[PDB]
Design a protein around this ligand. Structure first.
Ligand code: SF4
Ligand code: F3S
Ligand SMILES: [Cl-]
Ligand SMILES: [Mg+2]
Ligand SMILES: [O]
Lengths: 269, 600
């Protein structure tokens, strides 16, 4: 029997769900048909309304303490929780209900992990990351907006193979994907080391792939697998295609100044 | 009960609630009332989420805005970024270089194809296709059906269909049905034969594997998908054919890769997606299921998009405007700058204006939340049993055009294109051709091939329907693949002629800006007419208002009580079983609802 996954969606943009289905190794098709049992997911599920709701009860009973809760998005605490309504009730009530009997909780993406865009100042909905609401369950954070596809399926594959959460850093992120800063193995690093920088978009330096530090690249302070694993079956990543990292896997990246303002104190990197 | 727009709304019948509406992006609640014969006589669209992007943007740098608003939606990923950079460029009078224009167009058209095809197979198909019926299909008859429906599609063998069927069998026989659990399989609302169901499920799986390849076009130009990067003044993906050409974002090898992906797209649209929609549409037409026209029969709008000469709007290849009252001989011009045209009401939305009897143009827009339930609510503020649509009932605002409720989306664009083509607009010839071809296939060619009676429906009859809405989306996907194939050639030709420019940085620094400015950016996004309206003051965002396609379509009632496209589309539809929302889902899904988009 394949491990049930109940994939809930709070306040979100759905980027993490979309990224998941880009995975090439493994194929999302194979994950869904052969690895997990994706029993609840607003994006893909046939059932709606009362029929959809009934699935949660059934799986929670039959597989108590042996299903994975995956959460994309986050709960709002303002508007009495009703800036995110599911089955006529606040999302936060669904979240807490399904979380209680999960064997593990995956916080997909920066929304679930930290807050992401809706939690940027002034956070009109008091959107709150999952780990501030669910405090008595094992959580793994998989941050990024969205995370890389193979990072998402890599986490699932590990959990299914070993029936364990992989080793986490102090912030709850899997070390197997988040141990390196972008800047460690970025292919433009030799340019950084030689003081060779883009200063204006489409300058001669940009056309030679010079370092994007002075254009605001936050690679030096951002942990992710983008420089090595890269995106969409290793086709590119933000820096390769010419835009600095905006820091999208780091907590509170929307409120660390303009994306185009450089980090200060270049010598520390 | 009251009458509006030719619809007789009546809430006295049996109330049915669908919450959550699934196989959409984001969060929606739908309620209907049905009469003694299970016909929908009232419909209520409730957007059940809000994040407040418009509020969050205040005080920030206009150059950063695209990245914030891109995160309105990961499904229609990048269209908001495009609208944002366009709005900022409009405000600051920045002209982007030709290569940046062409790259943005290619990215936009890649999104159209990806979004449309994934929508149809992975979100919509299960409203038309009974996956359990697929288990009964004969592989040889399925192969024969495939060869009739799409002769050129090479994945057609009995053995291929048998292998797919056997995997589905093993999946179902496990007892863990996953996304098919508690479905509405076996409902009389499903009309396809087993072989058609197996063909469609096979293509669901094919599309799931292929969709990840198409987006690699975004990855090359924008670094990643979802959420590729954009730039005020052009694109970041600098071009170098020879020069560190291997370290440049765009070199000839990368451009060749893009073309290979475009060519695959053209094959998929022509051999899989369009033929499937024509076949499924034909069979549901034969069953008489022509419900769901709603406002498409009268009022449609799009801003118009894809000018074959940049910054020259008369050359739009999806020409826009507004049609009213079903009069296809008269297309009114739509101007996003005109304060009397696009306006948003909040009379029935969870927001507050000073005066909710008027609609605000988005340069004057206001987003102050006001979550409050009406006196006739069944349940409580935090436990709603039946929402009160006489009061405020949605996080979606109510956009109107000169006070009129409009449908937006691919169908609207195809009706507009047809009207334009008939008036002598040559830029709309291709969509006109696709429509005429489609009508002939649905009326005559496919019925002949399947031994069904030939019909004589006009485009006026076929198009304003849930079938028509689904068809226009598929045709639009095909057209967008064709257009970006041409855009690729134009890009490579321009680069080879010696123009390698990708960004205009003359006004990158805010010290060059006017101390205040306003701008608007529009996009024919996958679901319809998208606009972003910005005011800039002292280098900062003063106001930022988005009016998004699902805001139009999913809107609640306005001050005058006029219904939006979703509510109108459900009206007057019979349900086989009022407790199984098959028909509600089929029609709502034909708009491709994006609820995060609608509310932002
Ligand atoms: S600053 Fe950015 S572009 Fe430069 S080497 Fe570090 S990660 Fe790469
Ligand atoms: S913006 Fe995000 S996708 Fe990677 S390169 Fe930076 S962590
Ligand atoms: Cl964050
Ligand atoms: Mg808005
Ligand atoms: O996102």
């Amino acid at each position: 029997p394949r491990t049930p996954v109940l994939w809930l969606h709070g306040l979100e943009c759905t980027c993490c769900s979309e990224s998941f289905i880009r995975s090439a190794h493994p194929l999302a098709k194979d994950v869904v048909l052969s690895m997990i049992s994706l029993d609840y997911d607003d994006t893909l599920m046939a059932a709606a309304g009362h029929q959809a709701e009934a699935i949660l009860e059934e799986i929670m009973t039959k597989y108590k303490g042996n299903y994975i809760l995956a959460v994309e998005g986050n709960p709002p605490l303002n508007q009495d929780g009703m800036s995110c309504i599911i089955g006529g009730r606040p999302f936060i009530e669904q979240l807490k209900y399904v979380a209680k009997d999960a064997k593990a909780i995956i916080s997909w993406g920066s929304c679930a992990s930290w807050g992401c865009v809706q939690a940027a100042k002034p956070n009109p909905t008091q959107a709150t990351p999952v780990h501030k609401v669910i405090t008595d369950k094992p959580i793994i954070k998989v941050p990024g907006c969205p995370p890389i596809a193979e990072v998402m399926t890599g986490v699932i594959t590990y959990m299914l193979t070993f029936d364990r959460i992989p080793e986490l850093d102090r912030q709850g992120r899997p070390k197997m994907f988040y141990s390196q800063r972008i800047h460690d193995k970025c292919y433009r690093r030799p340019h950084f080391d030689a003081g060779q920088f883009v200063e204006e978009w489409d300058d001669e330096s940009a056309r030679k792939g010079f370092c994007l530090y002075k254009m605001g690249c936050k690679g030096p302070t951002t942990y992710n697998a983008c420089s090595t694993t890269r995106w969409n079956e290793g086709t590119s990543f933000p820096i390769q295609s010419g835009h600095g990292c905006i820091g999208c896997s780091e907590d509170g990246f929307w409120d660390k100044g303009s994306f185009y303002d450089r980090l200060t104190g270049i010598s520390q990197f | 009960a009251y009458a509006t727009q030719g619809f007789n709304l009546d809430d006295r019948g049996r109330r049915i609630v669908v919450d959550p509406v699934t196989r959409i992006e984001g969060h929606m609640r739908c309620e209907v009332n049905v009469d003694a014969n299970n016909v929908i006589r009232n419909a209520v669209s409730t957007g059940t989420m809000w994040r407040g992007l418009e509020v969050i943007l205040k005080g920030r740098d206009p150059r950063d805005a695209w990245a914030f608003v891109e995160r309105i939606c990961g499904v229609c990923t990048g269209c908001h970024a495009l609208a944002s950079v366009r709005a900022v460029e409009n405000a600051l009078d920045i002209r982007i270089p030709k290569n940046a224009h062409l790259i943005r167009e290619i990215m936009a058209k890649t999104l159209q194809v990806h979004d449309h095809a994934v929508h149809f197979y992975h979100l919509h198909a299960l409203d038309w296709v009974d996956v359990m019926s697929a288990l009964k299909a004969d592989p040889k008859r399925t192969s024969e059906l495939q060869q009739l429906v799409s002769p050129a599609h090479p994945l057609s063998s009995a053995g291929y269909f048998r292998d797919i069927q056997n995997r589905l069998k093993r999946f179902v026989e496990s007892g863990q049905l996953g996304p098919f659990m508690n479905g509405y399989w076996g409902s009389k609302a499903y009309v396809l034969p087993p072989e058609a169901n197996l063909m469609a499920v096979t293509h669901y799986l094919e599309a799931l594997d292929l969709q990840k390849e198409w987006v690699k076009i975004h990855t090359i130009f924008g670094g990643k998908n979802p959420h590729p990067n954009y730039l005020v003044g052009g694109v970041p993906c600098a071009i170098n054919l020879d020069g560190g050409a291997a370290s440049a974002p765009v070199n000839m090898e990368r451009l060749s890769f893009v073309k290979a992906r475009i060519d695959e797209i053209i094959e998929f649209n022509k051999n899989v997606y369009v033929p499937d929609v024509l076949a499924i549409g034909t069979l549901y037409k034969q069953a008489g299921w022509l419900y769901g026209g709603g406002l498409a029969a009268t009022n449609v709008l799009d801003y118009g998009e894809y000018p074959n000469v940049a910054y020259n709007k008369s050359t739009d290849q999806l020409p826009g405007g507004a049609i009213l009252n079903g009069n296809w001989d008269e297309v009114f011009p739509v101007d996003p700058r005109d304060s009397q045209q696009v306006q948003e009401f909040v009379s029935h939305s969870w927001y507050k204006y000073a005066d909710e009897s008027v609609g605000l143009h988005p340069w004057d827009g206001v987003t102050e939340p006001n979550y409050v339930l009406g006196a006739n609510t069944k349940g409580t503020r935090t436990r709603i049993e039946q929402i009160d649509e006489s009061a405020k009932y949605s996080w979606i605002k109510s956009p109107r055009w000169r006070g009129h409720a409009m449908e937006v989306g691919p169908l609207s664009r195809y009706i507009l294109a047809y009207a334009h083509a008939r008036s002598g607009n040559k830029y709309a010839e291709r969509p006109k051709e696709q429509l005429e071809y489609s009508a002939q296939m649905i009326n005559s060619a496919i019925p002949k091939a399947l031994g069904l009676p030939e019909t004589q429906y006009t485009l006026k009859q076929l198009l304003p329907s849930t079938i028509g809405r689904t068809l226009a989306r598929a045709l639009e996907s095909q057209y967008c693949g064709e257009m970006m194939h041409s855009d690729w050639h134009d890009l490579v030709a321009n680069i080879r002629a010696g123009d390698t420019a990708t960004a205009n940085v003359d006004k990158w620094d805010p010290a060059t800006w006017p101390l205040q400015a306003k701008g608007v950016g529009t996009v024919a996004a996958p679901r319809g007419a998208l606009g972003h309206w910005i005011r800039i003051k002292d280098g900062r965002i003063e106001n930022y208002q988005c009016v998004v396609p699902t805001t139009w379509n999913g809107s609640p009632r306005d001050y005058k009580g006029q219904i939006g496209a979703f509510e109108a589309s459900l009206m007057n539809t019979p349900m086989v079983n009022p407790e199984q929302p098959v028909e509600i889902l089929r029609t709502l899904h034909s708009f491709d609802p994006c609820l995060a988009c609608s509310t932002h």
